[PDB]
Design a protein around this ligand. Sequence first.
Ligand code: CLA
Ligand code: CLA
Ligand code: CLA
Ligand code: CLA
Ligand code: CLA
Ligand SMILES: CC1=C(/C=C/C(C)=C/C=C/C(C)=C/C=C/C=C(C)/C=C/C=C(C)/C=C/C2=C(C)CCCC2(C)C)C(C)(C)CCC1
Ligand SMILES: CC1=C(/C=C/C(C)=C/C=C/C(C)=C/C=C/C=C(C)/C=C/C=C(C)/C=C/C2=C(C)CCCC2(C)C)C(C)(C)CCC1
Ligand SMILES: CC1=C(/C=C/C(C)=C/C=C/C(C)=C/C=C/C=C(C)/C=C/C=C(C)/C=C/C2=C(C)CCCC2(C)C)C(C)(C)CCC1
Ligand SMILES: CC1=C(/C=C/C(C)=C/C=C/C(C)=C/C=C/C=C(C)/C=C/C=C(C)/C=C/C2=C(C)CCCC2(C)C)C(C)(C)CCC1
Ligand SMILES: CCCCCCCS[C@@H]1O[C@H](CO)[C@@H](O)[C@H](O)[C@H]1O
Ligand code: OEX
Ligand SMILES: [Ca+2]
Ligand SMILES: [Ca+2]
Ligand SMILES: [Cl-]
Ligand SMILES: [Cl-]
Ligand SMILES: [Mg+2]
Lengths: 39, 341, 455, 60, 37, 79, 28, 334, 32
Amino acid sequence: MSEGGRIPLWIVATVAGMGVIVIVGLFFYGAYAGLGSSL
Amino acid sequence: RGWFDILDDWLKRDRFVFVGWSGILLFPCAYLALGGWLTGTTFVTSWYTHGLASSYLEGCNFLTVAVSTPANSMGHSLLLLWGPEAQGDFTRWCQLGGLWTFIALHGAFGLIGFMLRQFEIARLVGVRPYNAIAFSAPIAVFVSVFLIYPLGQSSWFFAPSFGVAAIFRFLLFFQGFHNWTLNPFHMMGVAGVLGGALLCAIHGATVENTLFQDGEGASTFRAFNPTQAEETYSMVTANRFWSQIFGIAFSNKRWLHFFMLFVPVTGLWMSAIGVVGLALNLRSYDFISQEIRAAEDPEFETFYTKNLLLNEGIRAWMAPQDQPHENFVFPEEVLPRGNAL
Amino acid sequence: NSIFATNRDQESSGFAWWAGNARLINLSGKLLGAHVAHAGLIVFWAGAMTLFELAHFIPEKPMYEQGLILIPHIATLGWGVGPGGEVVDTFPFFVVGVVHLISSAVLGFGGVYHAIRGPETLEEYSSFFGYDWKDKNKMTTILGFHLIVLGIGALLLVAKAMFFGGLYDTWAPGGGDVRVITNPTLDPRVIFGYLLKSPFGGEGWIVSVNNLEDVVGGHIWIGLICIAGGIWHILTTPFGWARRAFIWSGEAYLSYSLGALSMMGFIATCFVWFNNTVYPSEFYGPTGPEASQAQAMTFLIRDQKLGANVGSAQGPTGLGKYLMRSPTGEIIFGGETMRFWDFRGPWLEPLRGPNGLDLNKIKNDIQPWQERRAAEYMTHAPLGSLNSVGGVATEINSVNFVSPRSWLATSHFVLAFFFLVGHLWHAGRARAAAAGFEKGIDRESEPVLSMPSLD
Amino acid sequence: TILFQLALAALVILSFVMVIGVPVAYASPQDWDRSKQLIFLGSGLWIALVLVVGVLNFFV
Amino acid sequence: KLPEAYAIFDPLVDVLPVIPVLFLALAFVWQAAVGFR
Amino acid sequence: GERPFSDIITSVRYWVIHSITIPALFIAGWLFVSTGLAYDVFGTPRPDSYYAQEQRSIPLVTDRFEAKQQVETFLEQLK
Amino acid sequence: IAQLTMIAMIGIAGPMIIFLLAVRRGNL
Amino acid sequence: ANLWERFCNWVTSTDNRLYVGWFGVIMIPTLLAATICFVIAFIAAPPVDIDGIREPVSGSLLYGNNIITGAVVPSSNAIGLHFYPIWEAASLDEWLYNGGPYQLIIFHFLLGASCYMGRQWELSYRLGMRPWICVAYSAPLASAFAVFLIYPIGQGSFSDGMPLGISGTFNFMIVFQAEHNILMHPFHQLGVAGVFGGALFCAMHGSLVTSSLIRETTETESANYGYKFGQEEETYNIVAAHGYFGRLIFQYASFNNSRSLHFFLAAWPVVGVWFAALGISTMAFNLNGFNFNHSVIDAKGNVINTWADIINRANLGMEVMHERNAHNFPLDLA
Amino acid sequence: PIFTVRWVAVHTLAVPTIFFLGAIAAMQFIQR
Ligand code: CLA
Ligand code: CLA
Ligand code: CLA
Ligand code: CLA
Ligand code: CLA
Ligand SMILES: CC1=C(/C=C/C(C)=C/C=C/C(C)=C/C=C/C=C(C)/C=C/C=C(C)/C=C/C2=C(C)CCCC2(C)C)C(C)(C)CCC1
Ligand SMILES: CC1=C(/C=C/C(C)=C/C=C/C(C)=C/C=C/C=C(C)/C=C/C=C(C)/C=C/C2=C(C)CCCC2(C)C)C(C)(C)CCC1
Ligand SMILES: CC1=C(/C=C/C(C)=C/C=C/C(C)=C/C=C/C=C(C)/C=C/C=C(C)/C=C/C2=C(C)CCCC2(C)C)C(C)(C)CCC1
Ligand SMILES: CC1=C(/C=C/C(C)=C/C=C/C(C)=C/C=C/C=C(C)/C=C/C=C(C)/C=C/C2=C(C)CCCC2(C)C)C(C)(C)CCC1
Ligand SMILES: CCCCCCCS[C@@H]1O[C@H](CO)[C@@H](O)[C@H](O)[C@H]1O
Ligand code: OEX
Ligand SMILES: [Ca+2]
Ligand SMILES: [Ca+2]
Ligand SMILES: [Cl-]
Ligand SMILES: [Cl-]
Ligand SMILES: [Mg+2]
C-alpha cells in the first residue's frame, strides 16, 4: 500500500538518525586509521 | 493558444518546486556547480596543478578537501572539456583543474538564474523585487572574487580554490601579499557584515521582548496568526526602551526594514570594489608617511609597521609551497625570522 | 484514549515540548524524580569514566600523557600513589570507579521510580517531603539540610587528610609524597586572608593556596561554617530585608544557583590553570607558567654547561638573556617568561634566595633531577590542537597530547559561561513572571502608553 | 574461583534485564501486582550478586 | 588495565562512558513517540 | 497538489522500494572505490603513485597546450 | 566486534523501552 | 518623602530621557572614565613598552599615528597580569611608559559594559517588557571579555590583550592565527556562520518586509510615510511575504509565524557569536584549531601536502616574525 | 510511468548522495 502512517514517524526518525550517527562515526574513525591519519 | 503560452503555463504552475523560465537556466547550472564540487572534493586530486592532495579519496577531511584552481601555466583558459588543453579527455580535464572552471562558470550562470528566479516569482506573486535587488551583493562578491580578481592576476591559479582550508589560505594570502585588512573597502565590508549581524540580532531580540500577550501559553509562539491585522509586538514600547538605553531608536518600521537591507548589501558591495583593486595589485598596502619616518628613525614603531613584518614572514614562508610554478628556492639564511623562533 | 489526555502536553501545561521540564515546576514528585535520576547520571559518569581511564591506564607512563582527569583527582587524595606521584597500586582507582557505578544504579532506580511511578506531587503524601516554592520557611529548611550535608562532605576531606592516610603533597620535603596533615591552619587571619586577596598577578586570590595545611584548615572552617549555617536555616525564617530583596519562586531559586555555579566554574578554570598544589603537576602536567619557566631553566642549564656566565649574559634587547629583574627587583628568568615570575614549583624553589633566583645556587646546586623535570615540563607545555596534536599550532603530527589542564580549563570556561547566560535568562524570566508580564504586554494595559513622552 | 567470571556475567545480564524491565513495568497499564513482585525479586537478586562479586573479587 | 579477572569486560568498559549521552538522545525518541505534544 | 513527504516515507510501499535501492546505490559507491575504478576515472594517484621511487619533485603542469602530454609523460615516469 | 556489539545492544535498549510501551499503550 | 526614597525614585525613573537605574549608577562613571582616558591616550599618550623589552610602540596621533595605525597600546609584558593602577606607579611618566592607560580603560570598560547589560534587563523590567534583549547583548559582551580579559588570563599577560586600535586589532588577529590556527577551530567557524548568516538573514528579512509593504503613498513620496509610529495594523502583508519566500525555496522552508522568524533572527547570530567568544576564550587555554599538518602520507612515507599544510606555512611566517626581539628560547609557550 | 518535478528534484540529489556516501565509507579502509 502507498498508505501513509503504516510505519510510525518516530521509528523512521530514530532509525535514520542512528544511521547518520553510524556513518559519521565511521568517518571519524577514518580520521585515525588509513589515509589521513598522519600515520 | 501558441506553444509559447502553453510552455509558459506549464513553467509557472504552482507546484512544490517552482520552475519558471528562470529554472531552465538555474536548475542545471546550480546542480552542476554543486555536483561538480561534491564530485571533485570526493574523488579529484590537485597533484598536477598544485602539488596537493584535495579529496576524501586521498585522505583529506571535510575541512581540507577542495576543488583546486588549475595550474598557473593554464593562464585564464576557460579549460572547456573539449578545448585544446584537455581535448575531450575527461580524466585529463580533471587532472588539469577543469572542474574549477566548470564550477565557477556554472556557478556564475546559476547565480544569474537564482536572481532571475527572485524577479520571476516576485512578478508572479505581485511583490516588489527587493529580494532580488539585495541579491546583487552576493553576486558582486562572487564575480569580483572568483572572476575579476584572478582575471587581473596571472591566471585562475590565484582565484580562491573551492574548499574550507583552501579559502582560509586565500584569506591569509590576502593578508600577507595585499595587506587586505588595511583596505578601507574591506573595512566597510566588515562594518556591513558585523553591523548586519548586529541588526539581525537586536531586531529579532527586540520583537521577541516587546510581544503583546496574545495567549495564555508560557511558550508565546502559538499566540500569533498569519492573517491577523495587528502588530504582534509593541513598536511604541520598543522605541521607548531603545531611546532610553541607547539614546536613539527606530520609530518607523518601513525605514527599519529598509535599513536592514541597506547595511549588509552596501557592505558586501564595498568589499567587492576593494577586491577589484586587488585584481591589479592596487592595494592599500602602505602609508608613505609612516615608511619615510620608519626608514630614517629606527626607534619609531607602530602597530602598522609590526603588521608588515608579519606580512613579510607570510610571503617568504608560504610562497615556495603556495606558488610552485615559480620554483622558488629560498636558502635558510635568507628567511626573515625574529630571534630564536 | 486522547493524545491530549494527560497533563504532559502544551495544552495542559502552557509549555512547549522544548521547554518540557518547566512542566515540573509545581510537581514535586516528578521533580524529585528528575533530580535524583540526574544525580544518578553524574555518579554513573564518575564511575564509568574512572573504569575507562583505568582500562586505558599504563601506570608507569605519566597520567597527563594519557588523557586522564579522574585518576588525577583520586591520586591527589593520596590513593594509589607514592613518592613523586608514582602509581604504586591501581586498586583504589578500581574501587572508586566500581562503587560510583554501583551507586548510580540505585540513584537511577529511585529517580525512575519517582519520575514515572511514585506520587506526582508530594504534598498530599507528606508535609515533610512536600513543599511550596513560595513557602520561605520550608525553602530555608531544605537549604539547611543540604548545607549540613555539604559541611559533612568538607569534613570528609579533612578526615582523609588527617586520619585516613593523608593527601598527595607535591611540596613534601625531599620530593613529592603522600603526607598526613597533623597541623591544619585554623588561624582565621590566614584562612580568610586568602578570600580578601586580590585576584591579580602575584596575588591570585584563593587560587594561590600553596600548602596542604591551608587547604585542610580551610575545609575545617568551611565544614563548620556550612553546618552552623544549615542549623541557622532550619531554625530561622528570612528577615524582612531579605523578603523584600529577592524574588520567591522556583525559577528565581534556580537562577540564583545558576549564577553561583557560573562563578564557581570560572573559579575552577583559574584553579586548574594556575594552581599546582591541589592540582599536582605530577598528575595534571605542568601549568602554562610552569612550562614556560621550565624552558628558560632548560636553556639556562644547557648554556651554563657550555661555559656561559648566565648572570652577566646580555640579551639582544639589553635585558638579561637568562636572568633579569621583576618590576620590584626580584631576580627572575628572562625572555617572554618574565610575565610568569610569580610561578612557584618544587623543582624551582631550591634555586630561590631572598632576592629571587640565586646566582650561586644556579652555578653550583642544580641537580640532575631538576634538569630532568624542567625538560619534561618544557616538552609537556599545555599547548595542543583540538584533535590532540601536542605542541604549538605549527607543529607537525607526531605527539598525541593535550594537557588535562587545558581540557579542564576550556570545558569549565564554556560551562561557566553558559551558566551565566542561564542565570540571566532565568533571573530575567523569574522577575517578569513574578510581576506578571513574562507572556507579553497587556494590549489593554500597555504601561508605556501611560507614561509621559520622553520629549 | 573464576565462576566469578560468571557471577559477574550474571549481574551484567540481570542488569540489562532490569534496565529494560523496570521502566516498562512502571508505565505499563496491565499486570502491576505481578510486575511489582518481580521488581522486588530483581532488586534483591541484584544487591546479592553485587555482594557476591564484591567478596569474590578478593579471591580471583 | 583493569584487574586481570575483569579483562573479559574491557570492550564493555569502553562503551559505558557514552551512556549518559544516550539518555539525552532518548528524551527525543520519547518525545517523538508522544508527538512532541 | 501532491502527497506530503511524511505520508510517503511512513508507507510500506516506500520502504519496500527503498530497502532495495538505498543499499544498492550505497554498495555501488562502495565498489566504485574498493575496485579502484574511482582512481582511473578521475586520474587520482593511488598512495604509490604520487612519486617514482627516488624523486621528490612534484609533477607540476608547466605548459598550457601540451598539458595533456605532460601528464602522460609524468604517468609513464612511474616506472 | 565485541565493542560494536555492546554498543548496538546498549543503544537498542532505550528505543526498545519506548517501542515496548508504545505497543502496549503504556504511560508514555 | 525620605531623601533616599526620592533619590531611588529618580534613579529608577521611567521618565528620564536616558534611563539611569542601579546598573547605571556604576555604568555611568566607569564608562565616562574609560572614554575620557581612551580619548586623551589615543590623541596624546607617548610610546608604550608593550612587550616588556624596552622597545616602546607609539600608539597616539601626536606621536606619529593616523586613525588607522593609532591605538591605546597594551600594558607591559613585565607587568604580566599584575594590577597596575596609577597609584602603583612612581609617576605618570612611568605609568605611561608601562601601558597604564590600557589597564585603566579596559577594566572600567568591561565593568561599564557588564552594567550596560544589566541596565537593559533593568529597563525592560521597569517598562513591563520581556527580559531577554540583555541576553542577546551578552554575545558581543562575551566577545569583549574574551579579547580583553580571558585571553590575557590564559596567556599570563595583558600585553597579549587586544590593543585598542584598528591596526592593533589586525596584529592581535594575525598573531592569534599563528599561535592557535583559529581559522581551523570549529568555534570560530561557527562565529563566521553566525556573522555571515546574521548579515544574510538581516538582508533577507529586510528585503522581504520591504518587498511586501502595503501601498499607502504615491510615487512622488517615500514609502516610509505609509507607516505611522504606533499604528495598530501591520504595515506589510506577511502572507504575500511568505507566498514569495515559500516559492523561492519551497513552501515549508519559509517562516509564516512572525514570532518564530524573529526568534530565529535573534538566535542565529547570538548563538554563533557566543561560540566565537568561546573560541577565543578556550584558545586562551591553548586548546587550538585542528592540526592536520602532514596528515596525508603516501605509500613510501612522503608527506603529500594539503591546503592545511599551506595554511601552516603562512602561520610559520607569522610566528617566526612576531615580536622579533622578544623570544630567547626556541618555543613560544605563551 | 508518471513522474513529478518534485520527484525528479529529490532524486537528482538523493541518488548521487547515497552512492557518494558508500564511496566515502569504503575510503575509510584504504591504507597507504
Ligand atoms: C542552461 C543550461 C546550461 C548552461 C547555460 C551551461 C553552460 C556552460 N557549460 Mg554546461 N551543461 C549543462 C547545462 C548548461 N551548461 C547540462 C545539462 C550538462 C550535462 C550534459 C552540461 C555539461 C557541461 C560540460 C561537461 C562542460 C560544460 C561547459 C559549459 C560552459 C561552456 C559552454 C559552451 O561553450 O557551449 C557552446 C554552445 C552553445 C553556447 C550553444 C548555443 C547554440 C546557439 C544559440 C545556436 C545558434 C542558432 C542560430 C540562430 C542559427 C542561425 C541559422 C543561420 C545559419 C541562418 C558554459 C559555462 C564546459 C565547461 O564548463 O568548462 C570549464 C564543459 O566542459 N557543460
Ligand atoms: C536529565 C535529563 C532529564 C530528566 C531526568 C527528565 C525528567 C522528566 N521529564 Mg524532561 N526532558 C528532557 C530531559 C530530562 N527530563 C529533555 C532533554 C527534553 C527535551 C527533549 C525533555 C522534555 C520533556 C517534556 C516535554 C516533558 C518532560 C517530562 C519529564 C518528567 C516525566 C517524564 C515521563 O512522564 O515519562 C514518560 C516516558 C516513559 C515512561 C518512557 C520511559 C522513561 C524512563 C524514565 C526510561 C528509563 C531508562 C533507564 C535506562 C531506566 C533503567 C533503570 C534501572 C535503574 C532499573 C520526568 C521527571 C514531562 C512532564 O513534565 O511530566 C509532568 C513532560 O511533559 N520532559
Ligand atoms: C568536564 C567535562 C569533560 C572534560 C574536560 C573531558 C576531557 C577529556 N576526555 Mg572525557 N567525557 C566527558 C566529559 C569530559 N571529558 C563526557 C560527558 C563523556 C561521555 C561522552 C566523556 C567520555 C570520554 C571518552 C570515552 C574519552 C574521553 C577522553 C577525554 C580526553 C580527550 C578529549 C577529546 O579528545 O575531546 C574531543 C573534543 C570534542 C568531542 C568536542 C566537544 C565539544 C562539544 C560537543 C561542544 C560544547 C557545547 C557546550 C557544552 C554547550 C552548547 C549549548 C548552546 C547550544 C546553547 C580529555 C582528557 C578520551 C580519553 O583520552 O580517554 C582517556 C576518551 O577516549 N572522555
Ligand atoms: C534526595 C533523594 C530522595 C528524597 C528526598 C526521597 C523522598 C521520598 N521517597 Mg524516594 N528514593 C530515592 C531518593 C529520594 N527519595 C533513591 C535513591 C531511591 C532508590 C533506593 C528511592 C526509592 C524510593 C521508593 C521505592 C519509595 C520512596 C519513597 C519516598 C518518600 C518517603 C521516604 C521515607 O519514607 O523516608 C524514611 C526513610 C528513612 C528514614 C531511611 C533513610 C536512610 C537512608 C537510606 C540512608 C541515609 C544516609 C545518607 C543521608 C545517604 C546519602 C546518599 C548520598 C551519598 C547520595 C519521599 C517522598 C516512598 C514513596 O514515594 O511513597 C509512595 C516509596 O515507596 N523512595
Ligand atoms: C548555599 C548557601 C546559602 C544560601 C543560598 C543562603 C541564603 C540565604 N541566607 Mg544564609 N548562610 C549560609 C549559606 C547560604 N545562605 C551559611 C553557610 C551561613 C553561616 C555563616 C549563612 C548565614 C546566614 C545569616 C546570618 C543570614 C543568612 C540569610 C540568608 C538569606 C539572605 C541572603 C543574602 O541576602 O545574601 C546576599 C548578601 C547580601 C545582601 C550582603 C552583601 C554581600 C556583599 C555585597 C557580597 C561580597 C562577596 C563577593 C561578591 C564575592 C566573595 C568574596 C568575598 C569574601 C570578598 C538567604 C535565604 C539572612 C537571613 O534572612 O536569615 C534568616 C541572614 O541574616 N544566612
Ligand atoms: C561534475 C560533472 C558532471 C556532473 C556531476 C554531478 C551532477 C554530480 C552530483 C553529485 C552529488 C549530488 C553528490 C552528492 C554527494 C553528497 C554527499 C557526499 C553528502 C554528504 C553529507 C553528509 C556527510 C552529511 C553531514 C551532516 C551535515 C551536513 C549536518 C549535520 C549532520 C551531518 C553531520 C550528518 C557531469 C556528468 C555533468 C559532466 C562532467 C562533470
Ligand atoms: C526520567 C526521564 C528520563 C531520564 C532518566 C534517567 C536520567 C535515568 C537514570 C538512570 C541511571 C543513572 C541508571 C543507572 C544504571 C546503572 C547500572 C545498571 C549499573 C550496573 C553496574 C554493573 C553491572 C557493574 C559491572 C562491573 C563491575 C561490578 C566490575 C567492573 C566491570 C563491570 C563494569 C562489568 C529521560 C531523559 C529518559 C526522559 C524521560 C523521563
Ligand atoms: C576551603 C578552602 C579555603 C577557604 C575557603 C573559604 C573560607 C571560603 C569562604 C567563602 C565565602 C565566605 C564566600 C562568600 C560569598 C558571598 C557571595 C557570593 C555574595 C553574594 C551576594 C549577592 C549575590 C547579592 C546580590 C544582591 C545585591 C548585591 C543587592 C540587593 C539585591 C541582591 C540581594 C540580589 C581556602 C581558600 C583558605 C584554602 C583552600 C580550601
Ligand atoms: C552500567 C551498566 C549497564 C547500564 C546500561 C544502561 C544504563 C543503559 C542505558 C541505555 C540507554 C539510555 C539507551 C538510549 C539509547 C538512545 C538512542 C539510541 C537514541 C537515539 C535518538 C535519535 C537517533 C533521535 C533521532 C531524532 C528524533 C527521535 C526526532 C527528532 C529528529 C531526530 C532525527 C534527531 C549495563 C546494563 C549495560 C550492564 C553493564 C553495566
Ligand atoms: C523562445 C523564443 C520566443 C519566440 C516565440 C515566437 C512564437 S511565433 C508565433 O507562434 C504562434 C503559435 O505558437 C503562431 O500562431 C504565430 O503565427 C507565430 O508568429
Ligand atoms: O607577547 Mn604578544 O605573542 Ca603570546 O606567543 Mn609568546 O607571547 Mn608574545 O609571543 Mn607569541
Ligand atoms: Ca492535556
Ligand atoms: Ca603499504
Ligand atoms: Cl607582532
Ligand atoms: Cl623566550
Ligand atoms: Mg582514513
